[PDB]
Design a protein around this ligand. Sequence first.
Ligand SMILES: Nc1ncnc2c1ncn2[C@@H]1O[C@H](COP(=O)(O)OP(=O)(O)O)[C@@H](O)[C@H]1O
Ligand SMILES: [Mg+2]
Length: 341
Amino acid sequence: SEQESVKEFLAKAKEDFLKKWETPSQNTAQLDQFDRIKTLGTGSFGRVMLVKHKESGNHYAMKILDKQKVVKLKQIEHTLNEKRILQAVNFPFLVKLEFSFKDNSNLYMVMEYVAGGEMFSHLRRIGRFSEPHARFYAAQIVLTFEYLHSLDLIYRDLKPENLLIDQQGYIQVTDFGFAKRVKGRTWTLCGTPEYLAPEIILSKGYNKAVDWWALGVLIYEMAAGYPPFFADQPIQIYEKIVSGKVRFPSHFSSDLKDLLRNLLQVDLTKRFGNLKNGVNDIKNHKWFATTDWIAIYQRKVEAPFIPKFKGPGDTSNFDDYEEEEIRVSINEKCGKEFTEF
Ligand SMILES: Nc1ncnc2c1ncn2[C@@H]1O[C@H](COP(=O)(O)OP(=O)(O)O)[C@@H](O)[C@H]1O
Ligand SMILES: [Mg+2]
């Protein structure tokens, strides 16, 4: 009956998610409440400077993003959706939006800061992961989805560059630009060619099931080094995906191979994850026997890699000198559009 504690947690999660979803938090800070140290990333619409909140002392990673440049890039909706999710969502493996606020010149998204970096570049460092070390990262992704999907959300953008390593060596998740709240099904072609599920390719209506295909791709690429479907031109990539014949490397476990063939199933009615048993197909799989799901959830597991910390305090601050500060315009720019933010 202790498995039934999961249902109760989700129910309380959902019942607490919709709460924040229906009436979203807003303007939970002034800019003049922390000083900016160093540009920790060149993000989608503006420099991402490091900050230290004066009240708490704690360090945060804050996204800056010009009002105009969103509309000029036609992504007003994208960014508004992205916030409304992060504002209302909450999980161990999701970057927390600590504060949100607008002014005249731009919106601000103060996020919880992570030492270490995106795991793509990390995967570039160490050629490929061993199965148990890879399992550690994958098992998280499961629980992160099980969560999101439970809320009728689909992340739709699972790819290494997105997910980042913790200070404590776990995973935190990216951005939600593409992530959508969908009860039924959807049609928007949005994603990265190697992780797109065949459904999306064929323009047939895809649903929540996709993220498991994505997981499959991610699980493969990790344990093998290369992705399962990779080509010089995207047209060629699609055809390899849809004609879903997958060739495994030599070292691949009989367990590991089985899961992948099940996650990378081209028939959505046969695809692991999206079945009668739901996620428990994945969670009760032989490749996930060793893993204690609840321990991973409370992070009570020894992470295979810990990025040498040196603290939050930068050894190279801003990586030498930088562009100084920021300026908020006198007149209001595009206020009507971001009334919700
Ligand atoms: N909390 C954070 N800590 C450290 N770096 C971050 C954080 N949030 C974002 N970044 C960096 O900013 C870049 C862009 O952010 P991303 O998550 O891709 O969202 P978006 O693409 O919408 O800007 C990423 O490459 C990432 O390295
Ligand atoms: Mg991104």
